[PDB]
Each structure stands twice: as structure tokens, then as C-alpha cells.
Amino acid sequence: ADFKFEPMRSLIYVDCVSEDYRPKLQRWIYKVAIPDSISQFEPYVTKYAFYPSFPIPPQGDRFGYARMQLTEHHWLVSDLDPRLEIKAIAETFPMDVLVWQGQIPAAEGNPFIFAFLPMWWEKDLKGKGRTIEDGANYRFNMTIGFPEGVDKAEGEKWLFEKVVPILQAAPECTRVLASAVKKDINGCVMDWVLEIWFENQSGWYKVMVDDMKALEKPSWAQQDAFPFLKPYHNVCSAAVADYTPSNNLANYRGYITMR
Amino acid sequence: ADFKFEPMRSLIYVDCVSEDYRPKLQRWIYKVAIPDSISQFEPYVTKYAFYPSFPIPPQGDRFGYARMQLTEHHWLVSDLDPRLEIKAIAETFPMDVLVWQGQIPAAEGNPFIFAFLPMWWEKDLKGKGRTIEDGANYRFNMTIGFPEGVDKAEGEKWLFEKVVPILQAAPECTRVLASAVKKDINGCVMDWVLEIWFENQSGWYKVMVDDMKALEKPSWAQQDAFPFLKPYHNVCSAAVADYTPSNNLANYRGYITMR
Amino acid sequence: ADFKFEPMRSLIYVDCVSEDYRPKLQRWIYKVAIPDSISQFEPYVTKYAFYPSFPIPPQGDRFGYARMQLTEHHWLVSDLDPRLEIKAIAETFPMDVLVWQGQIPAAAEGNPFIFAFLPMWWEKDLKGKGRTIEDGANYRFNMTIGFPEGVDKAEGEKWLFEKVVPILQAAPECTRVLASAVKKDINGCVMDWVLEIWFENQSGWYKVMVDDMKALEKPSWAQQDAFPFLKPYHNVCSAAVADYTPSNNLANYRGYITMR
Amino acid sequence: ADFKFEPMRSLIYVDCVSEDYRPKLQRWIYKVAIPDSISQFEPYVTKYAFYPSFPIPPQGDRFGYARMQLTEHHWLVSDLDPRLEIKAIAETFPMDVLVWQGQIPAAEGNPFIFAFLPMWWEKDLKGKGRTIEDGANYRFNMTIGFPEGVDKAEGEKWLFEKVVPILQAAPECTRVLASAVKKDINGCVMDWVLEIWFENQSGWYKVMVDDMKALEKPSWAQQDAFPFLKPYHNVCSAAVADYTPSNNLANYRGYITMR
Amino acid sequence: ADFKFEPMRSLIYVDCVSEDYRPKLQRWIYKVAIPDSISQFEPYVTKYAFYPSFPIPPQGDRFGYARMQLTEHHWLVSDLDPRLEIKAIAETFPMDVLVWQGQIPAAEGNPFIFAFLPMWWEKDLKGKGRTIEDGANYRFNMTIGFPEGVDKAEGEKWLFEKVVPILQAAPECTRVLASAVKKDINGCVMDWVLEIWFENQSGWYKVMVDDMKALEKPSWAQQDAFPFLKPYHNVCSAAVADYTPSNNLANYRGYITMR
Amino acid sequence: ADFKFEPMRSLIYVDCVSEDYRPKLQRWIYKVAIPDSISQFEPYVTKYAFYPSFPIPPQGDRFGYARMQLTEHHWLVSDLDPRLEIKAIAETFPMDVLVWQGQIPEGNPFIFAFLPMWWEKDLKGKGRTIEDGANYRFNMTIGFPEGVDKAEGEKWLFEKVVPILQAAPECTRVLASAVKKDINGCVMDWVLEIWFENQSGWYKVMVDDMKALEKPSWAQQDAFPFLKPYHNVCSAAVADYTPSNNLANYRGYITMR
Ligand SMILES: O=C1c2c(O)cc(O)cc2O[C@H](c2ccc(O)c(O)c2)[C@H]1O
Ligand SMILES: O=C1c2c(O)cc(O)cc2O[C@H](c2ccc(O)c(O)c2)[C@H]1O
Ligand SMILES: O=C1c2c(O)cc(O)cc2O[C@H](c2ccc(O)c(O)c2)[C@H]1O
Ligand SMILES: O=C1c2c(O)cc(O)cc2O[C@H](c2ccc(O)c(O)c2)[C@H]1O
Ligand SMILES: O=C1c2c(O)cc(O)cc2O[C@H](c2ccc(O)c(O)c2)[C@H]1O
Ligand SMILES: O=C1c2c(O)cc(O)cc2O[C@H](c2ccc(O)c(O)c2)[C@H]1O
Ligand SMILES: O=C1c2c(O)cc(O)cc2O[C@H](c2ccc(O)c(O)c2)[C@H]1O
Ligand SMILES: O=C1c2c(O)cc(O)cc2O[C@H](c2ccc(O)c(O)c2)[C@H]1O
Ligand SMILES: O=C1c2c(O)cc(O)cc2O[C@H](c2ccc(O)c(O)c2)[C@H]1O
Ligand SMILES: O=C1c2c(O)cc(O)cc2O[C@H](c2ccc(O)c(O)c2)[C@H]1O
Ligand SMILES: O=C1c2c(O)cc(O)cc2O[C@H](c2ccc(O)c(O)c2)[C@H]1O
Ligand SMILES: O=C1c2c(O)cc(O)cc2O[C@H](c2ccc(O)c(O)c2)[C@H]1O
Ligand SMILES: [Cl-]
Ligand SMILES: [Cl-]
Ligand SMILES: [Cl-]
Ligand SMILES: [Cl-]
Ligand SMILES: [Cl-]
Ligand SMILES: [Cl-]
Ligand SMILES: [Cl-]
Ligand SMILES: [Cl-]
Ligand SMILES: [Cl-]
Ligand SMILES: [Cl-]
Ligand SMILES: [Cl-]
Ligand SMILES: [Cl-]
Ligand SMILES: [Cl-]
Ligand SMILES: [Cl-]
Ligand SMILES: [Cl-]
Ligand SMILES: [Cl-]
Ligand SMILES: [Cl-]
Ligand SMILES: [Cl-]
Ligand SMILES: [K+]
């Protein structure tokens, strides 16, 4: 019988690998994914939302920048409980979506990154007490997973002892938050999620490219420059606004077409 | 102090024993039951909905067909916890409602069937992977309880080894789902709930009447024909659509009268 | 340029000619019709609603009883203005729907699409003025009628109000009587009158609309032996509905969410 | 046939003549009036709202201060068109409500003031360009009607040439707005509606009592002090906030009771 | 990792120490507090609501009468879990609010009373089975905490064996409910919350002042008359209606200004 | 007294002249503009919506491509009636917004076009439903330069430009309405919506197929659309659906966690 109370926030990194796909992918998301999703998890998900990503910044490609959006669930139970595999109605999820997101080509293909977190950030490392009145945030959400055969403790150490200090040093960076990915849920390859706030694109660039040149290149690096990880495979990211109109449990009133 | 996290889906089988009662019963449900209900359980029920039943099919009477609707709650806690018996405001629930539903007459009445289930089906026995795009479903929801002094294991065996195979054999039947009733909650007499999908009434009839003639009549049978159980006492049912507008936690905006 | 302020209530009489069609028709209505409709007229329709019909009563067939629902719009402008024919996105409205509703017979003769325009308020209040909702639940029998070809409209009117209505007023089982004249100038609808006639329940309806109405003289233009003396689904349609619907679509619709 | 496009804002001044009545009156308003109202005018009213009145200030009684609320409609057509007298369902409006509001006593009662206006203010006389960011407003809405046999032109002149200048002189007064009442609609006795903003009660008092002592007492005065008009008969008023949660066409989800 | 399922109803007693503050405080609550709050706890709070308090009755000051409102949350988890201290965006909560509520004097200064309860009343002591149809309720919600060095068991005994019987004796009192405050959550000084229903203000007065004169004055009393406790410090209260339009999770559509 | 029933659809072409401005402009729109707007016109506007623009396509700059969104109102009355100038509460609309949109730095006009609520001309793709697939909806407005006969401009548009659209299978729809110049003296004359399947289709037709066009004598640039970007032409490409249907959807400026 028993089901465990397991309150979590999940993030899905939705890419769009080509502008010609964007209409079609966006359609599927707002016309199909939403109702199909709510139809299943309404009773045990307290918040379902999409945060469309800002235009990819210079060198965003190197950070596995998701060119469509972040998809964000708040669960009361583990969606990976085997018992939850059974659904009266199943979702309509064509191959094409995987093409559009870049999981498949038509190029090598790219994993589907679905990270589970506690509902609250584990580490507040810069900008505690910042209110919304303090101004609009360029919120750079980035997840990372250390390559195979790299001790996780060492990766952690690198992240917090070498990377974060650079963020703290930069006045252009207004906030730093981190949570450890719950690997015990769906075997997601990622280890950490961070959100790193700037004022704008230029701030992001200055810090995440230029300030990060100062970093020692680690021996396990999969690219020459920070983040030293394979785009879309061991790192994904998006820059998003403070607010989304796509708070789907409250806001969705059907797929009403423009006139 | 402590309250157990106990996520469940419940079903109430609401009959209407006479067309002359229908206006009055429907009024009570939508004018009174909804606000009275929400007023009590809003904070610990994630979904409250009514699925009005399709017109009773031929020989539906023999299946304890609920001629008004299904009432459907999703609980986060056991509503039968004794501590939940205390309410500031109590509901308005007159005798007349029980007359209308057939719990009372005006020479014997019919029990109130209130079945608690896990939030997800335990057994998927036909039609896995069916999406909503596959077409409109005549969803025949049926619950059953084996008569007194009938070994539950034998009843189970009969159901899955004799009844279900007939459902699987019939191309007219698109889906079969089952959960065991949680008897430990409110001593509901029912043992199983199934949902059995057809394309329409004629499909339902063909299978649930005609194909079921082939069944051996068991020694505990309370009627000659399948389902071999006492209508409204050891079997209730309803046929409903895939969709209801009465998703009460989202949709209810008062008892607005037509003009 | 100019567009006329033309506030109206319309009614569409949606039949379902067979129980095997009901799932499919209902699907189309709630999954497709709603979004397609709102997508077009949201800015100039103040209220869009469906009132599902109660189970067809005995001899309801003779009154063109719509076995699915009433569809109800409140317009700010005439939807039949020619300029409103142009739509960026068009609706998905397959033949099959017409089969299901009974406009087409599929593969004798089908049944017209009855789409009646009215003023937003009833023109005639003939019984039960001042009745509140506290007075109890209503079996609301909405019925529209059109007098056959070559029947003087004035005479039809006279018959309706001087012969039919008095029977309704005589019956204690009948709690309310309302009528409006159909706006024929809008979409050439064949109907002339819409009435709503309230009872307590089905039995009341039957007693009055069948039994009390036997007393009526059969008029010379009658298209059937018994009241309403008009061709089912062609010169008369009807539905019995509740006081309340959850399908108030402009407020309530949150997508086609499926049961679990 | 034809119906005139007649876009108007109306105000009803709802008093509560005794604290013992307040529960009962408030109940009727939110439990009964709202649904009954929407049930009638949903299709031709674009906004229906209640603005509960702040606690009656010192000497508010002399201004016909409505101790319950303002009721506010936005019409597309004249509700006094005779054709609109016909309604399928009628409202439940007991005598008691009139007692509670003070239309009836137990030694003389008070008229029901229902004033129709254009949807936009006709005169902006102080504080043009004030935004909501400029701070919270004590919004003193007051309507007045000159006694019988008082030339309307003279009344107008008095109002704008003697009264208003005092408002403009007072720094405590942040805003002044006025519209002429549409007398042609429902024969309302009132001639003008003004809204006069302060920072708070004390500001209101300073200006509307103390500064107004300087006013010449006119020969038609029905009381010694400004506003020189018979409370609740030739003057009503309320002080309200910038925002109400009772925006009934959007917000109402039934009469849900506290737990 | 693990987070405890901890379903609770909390109450905050919001005072307004001066009518000149009321506009400003009300503004902050509805313009700022709501969005700031929802922005944080939407996923783990099932109901967030304000119940504005009726006008302070005679001698209400002696009961720590909250002159603005009750603030009411329903939690799924303890908000005092240390891990919940971390928020991406923090709330805007100026000093001024504390002045307005009376926590600071800008007069002696008064604690912020934030009481956690089970979601259901622990004791039903009068009026069980009362429905909303039985009439409108003057709901007097009162919380109390016994002064320092007063045995809690004795306080309890006094409350239930001496105070409550007076409530039961009075036909003017329609309902009595009580829950023990969860002291283990946020060290709230209060021990009990009761709701005590009347028909109106006069009923309240008759019982809570006049009938309560009959009470023996205990040796620990901090004032001469019942409730024998220090206003706003060891007792707070409010009288509220059965219904509020400020059911914020459902109803809030922005801070829309009147016209 | 009397107010004229004047049902109209308006479009505002909201640019964002720099990515560094985008956070700030977007904030103002969703945090401030919405409530300020609804607070004023709720009773006489039936639909208020934002359609965020797709990423600017190649050579979009030449079409006055609005890099933030389209803003879309449906009015029951003329918002330019002088009597509607009076508001209890006024909007917060700082200079900075005009900088961000590009009205202020040469500087670019504020394009606010009023239309009938229904398209006047349906020139390709009549009867297309939403089931026919997702649309790249290229909304473009144009105004002929000063001293250019309007009749000739019209003729050019419908007899030379549109036929190229009709010829292209990549173009699924063509719609046009004449701008109501009598309302707010908007400089634009026409609004068209022109549908494609995607960006590449748009480009193929609106750049490559349009090379075939004779360059008119009044042209303000060498290539189609032959009009001054952001001044005599603005445009946006948008989706069939927006979540920002503000009268229904807005529940406050709730921040991500
Ligand atoms: O929005 C969603 C979404 C999406 O936007 C893009 C995508 O590529 C996959 C998706 O899948 C999400 C999902 C997660 C967990 C579930 O259990 C589920 O049924 C659906 C869905 O909600
Ligand atoms: O959780 C999952 C999921 C889901 O629950 C719901 C849903 O609507 C889509 C989904 O899509 C995920 C997926 C698809 C393709 C892949 O290649 C892959 O690795 C993962 C799957 O894992
Ligand atoms: O709280 C309750 C309730 C309610 O809140 C609202 C309402 O509209 C009906 C109700 O009735 C429920 C009920 C449960 C079991 C029974 O056997 C029964 O007869 C009634 C009761 O639990
Ligand atoms: O809709 C409802 C309902 C109904 O439709 C019909 C009916 O006969 C009883 C009902 O009672 C339901 C209920 C069950 C358990 C509870 O604990 C409760 O509070 C309410 C109520 O929700
Ligand atoms: O716009 C329309 C429309 C729509 O948008 C959506 C929808 O689901 C059905 C519809 O049906 C209407 C209709 C079609 C054909 C007729 O012959 C007729 O009288 C009415 C049509 O006008
Ligand atoms: O619900 C609706 C409906 C329906 O249920 C059944 C049906 O057979 C036709 C319908 O058509 C309605 C409609 C009428 C006029 C229009 O101009 C329009 O756009 C749509 C639609 O709204
Ligand atoms: O339709 C109306 C109405 C209503 O629909 C609902 C309701 O709750 C109250 C109402 O009261 C209004 C009214 C106006 C003037 C009066 O003098 C009076 O007694 C009542 C009336 O216009
Ligand atoms: O809120 C309302 C209201 C009220 O609060 C108090 C009151 O004393 C009368 C009222 O009557 C309003 C109303 C006015 C004109 C109408 O035509 C109508 O139908 C209703 C109603 O809406
Ligand atoms: O409405 C609210 C509120 C209020 O009205 C008045 C007040 O003086 C403080 C407040 O604070 C409440 C709150 C409690 C716990 C939290 O964790 C939180 O984030 C917010 C807030 O919801
Ligand atoms: O969690 C809390 C909280 C919060 O999260 C958000 C918010 O907007 C207000 C809040 O108010 C509470 C508070 C404020 C000041 C105090 O002096 C005090 O004792 C308590 C605090 O408990
Ligand atoms: O009321 C108005 C308004 C508003 O309420 C809210 C808002 O966010 C912007 C606004 O802007 C409108 C406007 C401003 C400047 C212009 O140059 C122009 O053409 C239009 C103004 O009319
Ligand atoms: O959202 C809107 C909007 C906008 O998004 C961007 C912008 O640059 C100006 C704007 O102004 C719109 C508006 C136009 C005319 C009015 O009279 C009014 O009150 C408001 C407003 O609604
Ligand atoms: Cl700001
Ligand atoms: Cl590299
Ligand atoms: Cl009873
Ligand atoms: Cl389909
Ligand atoms: Cl038995
Ligand atoms: Cl057994
Ligand atoms: Cl039998
Ligand atoms: Cl009743
Ligand atoms: Cl016959
Ligand atoms: Cl709405
Ligand atoms: Cl402020
Ligand atoms: Cl007089
Ligand atoms: Cl006097
Ligand atoms: Cl501060
Ligand atoms: Cl009552
Ligand atoms: Cl103490
Ligand atoms: Cl004392
Ligand atoms: Cl909601
Ligand atoms: K480096």
C-alpha cells in the first residue's frame, strides 16, 4: 500500500535545435503536453510551469543552452515509483519531439535531462535577502554532471572551492544558489543544479566566459573552456525571467488561437 | 499529533431512482454539496469532481447502474481518521437525498457505496498505451463485493481467470483496469473496482451481456446472469465520458441560474 | 466601417440521434467546438454555455427533443454580418457531426439545423413572475416552433396565446411560462417563437403537454395528430434542462482534461 | 427591437444601520446577492464589484456614510429599459435587507441611492497624473442632490466655485474628481458624484470638517455644517481603498465557509 | 533528505493600531504580501486566506482584538523547518508594517502572534452539527497563553472547568471549539485557540463581559476582568464572518485599482 | 453624453533594441503594464493579450521586426475619444520604456494601429483550421511614404506583392485590413498577416521570391519591402497561441523559486 511523502521540484531542459522546428515544438508543448500532463498528475502535483528561455547568449552552445524552455514540476510523490507507471490515458509524445529537442537527429543525439531536487535550495552562496524590488534578474539556471570515473567528492570540491569563488568575486553576479540532484530517483547523470543571477546577457558573458578564463583546466575536462563539460550531455542551462505566464495549473484555459 | 500521508482516490456511486427526483437531486449536488464539501476539505483534497453517468443502457439495472453520477475525491489523508469527524460547519444533507439516491424507500433500500482506492490502478489488463487521440471512450466503471461467507481468494480467482479473459477476447473492449478496494478505511463491502472501456453502448451490451452468457453460473450467485451479484448492494456501476466540466475545485463559480 | 450594436441571445438545438453516437458527439463538443468557438468570438460574445438536456421524456420525440443539449450564445453583434464570415483560423466541423445531430442520415431525409436568435430578455412573462430560485428546482422545458408554409403568422400567434398558453396557466403543475419572438431578419430561421415552460418534473411535463393538451382542437394545418401539431425537428424542437450548468464556457473551460 | 448602447458606471450606497445587523446583511450580500445578480446580468455587465467601506470616521453620520460598502456595476445598456424588467429567475431580496440598510425603520427611513454615471469622470480637478505607485489612497466617494426648489445651475456653481477651491487649497487632499449624475435613467435625486482622496481619516477630517467651516452657510442648507444636506437623503458617501478582492465577475467561487 | 508530512492550520493575528495606518497596511497586505507569499509557498500550501475582522466591539481592546484581520495558512510541511529558510526571492517587509500592526511604537510594543494548529479542531464543546443554514455567525476567534510560571495543566483545567461552562450556559453562544497550540513549531507563547460563536456583537458582549464577571479572579491574573491576561501579549482575538472573498490562492488576479 | 459603439482590434509593435534591455522591458510589461492597463479599461475591453515575437529572422531588421512582442487590444469604444483621457489612477510609463523600445536613443515612432475586429480581405488559405498544423504568423504593417498616392500604393500591394505570396507554396495564408487612420493618425495604411510553416519559408518568399519585384520610385530601401524600417514598416512573427491572455490569465507577478 504505502506511498512516501516525497516533496520535490524537478527541472527538464527543453532544447530546440533549429528555428524551423520552433513553431511545431511550441505547438506540441502548449496544445498537447499541458492537457496530457494535467490529465495524469493534477492530484499529486502542486505546480506545473514553463519558463521560456531568453535568446541564446554568445557561447551559450558551450553550456548546453536549452533554446525552448525550462519545464518545472512540484511533486508530492516520486513520479518514478513503479506503481505510477500505470495510467488510464497515456500522453501523445511523437518521435518528432525528440528530433526537435535534439534527443535524436534526422549531429549526434543528446540525452533527456530530467533532474529532481528538494523543493528548497540547499546552498545559498550569494545574494541572500534579495527581493524582487531589487530589480529584474537574468536567471542563469545550469546543471552539471561529472564525467565517468570522476570521483564525485572531487567534482563537488572543485565546484565550491574554485568555481563559486569567481562568482562571488564578480559584482555583476547578484545571486548564487545550488542543490544536489537526487540521483536516487531516475538515475539522472547530473550532480548539481545552480542558479546564477546577473543583470543581463553582458554580465553573464563577462563572468561565465571572461572571468572563468582564470580557471585551471581540470584533467577530466571535455572542452577547453569553462564549463569543461560536454554540451547538452554533462551540462545544460537556460537563462529565464523572474516571471512566467505559463503557470499551467492555474492559467491554462485551452489552446485558443489568435485571430 | 501525527497524521498519516495517505493518498487515495475515492468513488461514490450516486443513483437517481426516479426521473421525478432528478431535478431535486441534481440541485442539491450542484447548489449545496459542492460548497459544503469544499468548505470542509479544500486544504487536503487535491481534486473533487463529478462524472455524470450516460443514460442507463439495456439491463443496466442488473449492474447497480448509478443513474446520476460518479463522485470522485483525491485525498491526501484518510477521511475516516476519527479526528476528522470534527467540523466547525457541518454539511446540509437531508433525508430526502437518501430517498432520491435509493438508500431509503417511501420494501428495502440500498447501501451507500463509498470505495477508497490507491490513486493509480493496480492492474492494467488490456489496452496499455492507449492515448486520448485513439478516440472517445464509453468508460464502464464497475465495483463488486463478494457475498458473505465467500472466500475472497476464490472470488478474486473467478474474476481474473474467468471474467477478465472474456473482456480480453472481445475486440469491442478497448481497455481493462482494476484496483483492490481498501477495506481497512471505511469497511466498504466492495472488493474490486474495474473500469472497462468500449466504443459505445452497443459494445458494452455485446460483451457484458451476450459474451458473458458463456459464463458458468457460480454457486454463490445472487442473480441468474452476470454479474451474478445483488444490484446496488454487491455491485454498482456507471458509464461515463473521458471528460467532465464538473472539476469542482477549479471550475465552480457559484450556482448561476439560466436566464 | 460601422458595426451595429445588436445584443442577442441565440439557441441551438443539438440532437443526438443514437446512443452509439453520444461519446463521439460529446467529445467533439467539449474537445473541439469550445476552443474553436472561443478562438473566434471571445471579443464580442459575453456568454457561451451548454445546457445538457435531461433524458428524453415519454413522447419527447414528437417535440423534436434535442437529446444532447442546448447551445447558448450572447452576442454583442449579428454573427450573420457578412464581414464576420472571414476568420483567420476556421473551425473543425466534420460531416460526421451532422450525422450525429441528425442533419444528415449517412451512407430518407434529414433534419434542419435550428439556430434561433432572440433579444437578450424575454418579451412575454405569462406565468410565474417573481419566482426565485429558492422556490425549488425547475424542469425547464424550452421549446421553439415555426408555423408551416402558407400559414398566416398572425393566426399562428393567436392560436398559441389564446388556445395553448391558457392550458399552461390552468395547470398547477406548470410553474412558469415565458416567450420571445424569433428574430427572423437575422439568419432566416424557420421558427417564429421560443417558449420556456417550467414544471416540477417529467411527470408534470407529461400531464400537461400530453394529457391536458388532448383537449386542444386540432388545427387545419396540423402536421401530426397530437399537440404540438408540428413536424418533429423541422417545425418544432425542444429540450428540458436544469436551472444550472457547469459548462459556462467563457469562465469555466480549462482544457479537455481526461479522467484517470 | 433596437437596444441602445449605453455604457455606464453605477454606484449603490449600502448602509448598515447597526452592528448587530452586520453579519446578516454581509451574509445576504455575499451568499445571495452575488449569484442572484450574475444570474441576471452576466451578458451585459462587464464589471460587478463591492468596495467595503472603511470604519465610519468622526462626523461621518453627517455625510450619509454607508457603513457596509459601495456596490459598483458597469453596464452596456440601461438597466431601467422597461424590457429588462422581465427575468426568468428573480432575486431573493427580503424586507429585512431594507431594515438593515435603513430604508425601513422600527422613526423615518432612508432612500435607496442608486446613481448612474458615464464610465469616465467628467471633471479632473486635482491630482491629474497620480499613479498607484504614489501611495495608498483614502478614497472619499460622495454624492449629493440639491433640495427641492434649488436652481441646479446655482448648486453647480456653489459646488465648483466655493467647495472645490477649498479642496484644491488643502495639501492633505491628493485628488478631486466629479461626474454629473444621469437623472434621465432612474430619477435618482442626486446631481453630482465626487471622489476626493486623502492620505487617511485625519486628512479627511481636517479638510471636510475643519477647512469647510470657512464656508458660507447657504440659504437652502438642511444642516448647519458642510455638506449642508440631509444625511442619507440628499447626501451619501463612503471611504474605500484603491483595491477590492470582491471583483465578483472574476473572483466569485461560491460561499465557502471558514473552518 | 527527508521532509515530514506535517499538515497544519496557522493563524496570524494582524492588528492595526490606528485608523490613519489602515490604508497603508491594507495596501501592503493585498499589493505586496500576497504575491510575495505565493511566490514562495504555492507548492506546499493548499490554502492561504485573509478574514478581515469586524469592527472592534466594546472592551475588545482587553482581548487583544486584531483590528485588521486574521491571516490563515494551511501547510503540508513545517514552515519552521530550517531548510525552508532559503528562498531565491525574499519578501518585502518594511519596518513600517510592524509599526502599523503595533509590534513597534514609532505605546509599549506587542509580539507577533503566529499560532500553529492541527487542521481540525481537537475539542467540539458546543453546537456540534450546526450547518450554515442555521444562520450567520459572529465568529470570535481567541488565542491565549498562560503567564510565566503558571502550571499549564492548571491553566487548562481552569479554562475547561470554569470558563467554558459559562459559554455552555449562555444560549447567546452558538458554538465552542478549541485546539491546543503546537508549541513545538515556532515557540509561540499561546497555549490554546478557541472559536466562540455568537449571533452578533451584543451576544458577544453579554457573555464575554457580563456573564464572565461571575468568574473568580485567579491569582495569576494580569488584568481585573476576564480574560485576566495581558492584551495583545497573552491574549489576541478577532471576530470574523463565515466567508471571506480573500481566498488568495484561488482569487488573486493582481492589485487592480478602482476607477 | 452619447458614446459610440466602435468595436476594434488594435496592434502595438513592441521592439526591444538591445538584449541588455530585455529583462527590464519584459519586467515592466508583465509586472506593471498589465495591472495598470486592466485597472483602466477592464469594463470596455473584451480582450487584452501579448504575443511574444519569435527570434528575429535573417534580414528581419529590414522589416521593422519588433523584437519583444505584439500587444493586442479589443475595444468596444474608441480609446482616442477625448473623454477617455481622464483616469482616476494613471499608468506608470517611464521614459526608459521608450529607450528600450527604441522610440528614444535618431529614434523610432510608436506604432499603434486600429483595425476592424475582422479581416477585410482573405486572399489565400481560406478554410485553414488549426488541425492543419503550426503557423509562423508574420504580421506586418506598412505606410506609404509622404506624397505617395494611397490608391497607387494599394494597387502595387495587391497587384504586384500579393501575387508572389499566392505563387509560393511555402505561404499558407494571406490576410489584410486597412488601418483606421481616422482614430489616432497612425501613419500605417495596411496590416497583413502572412503565414509560413517556418523561418526558412518566410525567408524564401519575403526575401528571395521578392527579389523579382520591380523597385518602385518611392522606395526608401533597395530591397522589398522598400520602406523605412520601424518608421514605414513594422512586423513580427508569432505563434498561433499565447499564454498571455491577460484578462483571463493574469494572477499577479509571481516569481520563480
Ligand atoms: O511538460 C512536460 C514536458 C515538456 O514540456 C517537454 C518534454 O520534452 C517532456 C515533458 O514531459 C513532462 C512530464 C514529466 C513527468 C511526467 O510524469 C509526465 O507525465 C510528463 C510534461 O509535463
Ligand atoms: O520521464 C520520461 C517522460 C515522462 O514521464 C512523460 C513524458 O510525457 C515524456 C517523458 O520522456 C522521457 C524520455 C523520452 C525520450 C528519451 O530519450 C528519454 O531519455 C527520456 C521519459 O524518461
Ligand atoms: O462530510 C461529509 C459531507 C460533506 O462535507 C458534504 C456533503 O455534501 C456530503 C457529505 O456527506 C459525507 C458522508 C460520508 C459518508 C456517509 O455514509 C454519508 O451518509 C455522508 C460526510 O462525510
Ligand atoms: O460531492 C459529494 C457527494 C455527492 O455528490 C453525493 C453524495 O450522496 C454525497 C456526497 O458527499 C461527498 C463527501 C464525501 C466525503 C466527505 O468527507 C465529504 O466531506 C463529502 C461530497 O463531496
Ligand atoms: O463559426 C462557426 C463555428 C465555430 O467557430 C466552431 C464550431 O465548433 C462550430 C461552428 O459552427 C458554426 C456554423 C457552421 C455552419 C452552419 O451552417 C451554421 O449555421 C453555423 C460556424 O458559424
Ligand atoms: O458550441 C457550439 C456548437 C455546438 O455545440 C454544436 C453545433 O452543432 C454547432 C455549434 O456551433 C456554435 C457556434 C455558433 C455560431 C458561431 O458563429 C460559432 O462560431 C460557433 C458553437 O459555439
Ligand atoms: O434587479 C435587481 C436586483 C437583482 O437582480 C438582484 C439583487 O440581489 C438585488 C436587486 O435589486 C435591484 C433593485 C434596484 C432598486 C430598488 O429599489 C430595489 O429594491 C432593488 C434590482 O434592480
Ligand atoms: O450587488 C448588488 C446589490 C447590493 O450589494 C445591495 C443592494 O441593496 C442591492 C443590490 O442590487 C444590485 C443590482 C442592481 C441593479 C440590478 O438590475 C440588479 O439586478 C442588481 C446587486 O447586483
Ligand atoms: O499574508 C501574510 C502575512 C500577513 O498578512 C501579515 C503579516 O504581518 C505577515 C504575513 O506573513 C505571512 C507569511 C507567513 C509565513 C511565511 O513563510 C510567509 O512567507 C509569509 C504572509 O503570507
Ligand atoms: O516566516 C515569517 C515571515 C515570512 O516568511 C514572510 C513574510 O512576508 C513575513 C513573515 O513574518 C514572520 C515574522 C516577521 C517579523 C517578526 O518580528 C516575526 O516574529 C515574524 C515570520 O515568522
Ligand atoms: O493609458 C495608457 C497606458 C496604460 O494605461 C498602461 C500602459 O502600460 C501603457 C499605456 O500607454 C498608452 C499610451 C502611452 C504612450 C503612447 O505614446 C501611446 O500611443 C499610448 C496610454 O494611453
Ligand atoms: O500593455 C500595453 C502596452 C504595452 O504592452 C507596451 C507599450 O509600449 C504600451 C502599452 O500600452 C497599452 C495601452 C494602450 C492604450 C491604452 O489606452 C491603454 O490604457 C494601454 C497597454 O495595455
Ligand atoms: Cl521597477
Ligand atoms: Cl573545445
Ligand atoms: Cl432531514
Ligand atoms: Cl478527434
Ligand atoms: Cl452478502
Ligand atoms: Cl477470504
Ligand atoms: Cl435473477
Ligand atoms: Cl432547498
Ligand atoms: Cl401523428
Ligand atoms: Cl474569468
Ligand atoms: Cl509602496
Ligand atoms: Cl428635498
Ligand atoms: Cl444641523
Ligand atoms: Cl524597512
Ligand atoms: Cl438565509
Ligand atoms: Cl508573562
Ligand atoms: Cl486592569
Ligand atoms: Cl484556480
Ligand atoms: K581556462
Residue numbers in the entry:
A (entry chain B), B (entry chain N), D (entry chain L), E (entry chain K): 1 to 106, 130 to 282
C (entry chain M): 1 to 107, 130 to 282
F (entry chain A): 1 to 105, 131 to 282
The authors write:
The bacterial chalcone isomerase (CHI) from Eubacterium ramulus catalyses the first step in a flavanone-degradation pathway by a reverse Michael addition. The overall fold and the constitution of the active site of the enzyme completely differ from the well-characterised chalcone isomerase of plants. The quaternary structure is a hexamer with D3 symmetry (trimer of dimers). The tertiary structure of bacterial CHI (polypeptide with 282 amino-acid residues) is separated into a catalytic- and solvent-exposed domain, both with ferredoxin-like folds, completely different to that of the plant CHI, suggesting that the enzyme activities convergently evolved from different ancestor proteins.
In this study, we underline the catalytic activity of the imidazole of His33 by comparison of wild-type CHI and its inactive His33Ala variant by crystal structure analyses in presence of taxifolin. The diffraction data of two CHI_H33A crystals soaked with DQH reveal electron-density maps identifying distinct substrate binding in the active site and the entry tunnel. The inactive enzyme binds the substrate in an identical position, as found for NAR. The superposition reveals a root-mean-square deviation (RMSD) less than 1 Å for DQH and NAR, and all substrate-recognizing side chains remain in the same position. Thus, the hydrogen atom at C3 is in the same position as previously described for catalysis. The C-ring of a second DQH forms stacking interactions (3.5–4.0 Å) to the B-ring of the substrate-like positioned DQH. The second DQH points with its A-ring to the position of the truncated imidazole side chain 33. The B-ring adopts the position of a helical turn (residues 121–125) of the closed lid observed in the NAR complex, and the C-ring runs through the centre of the salt bridge Glu91–Arg125. This artificial and less specific DQH binding is in competition with lid closure.
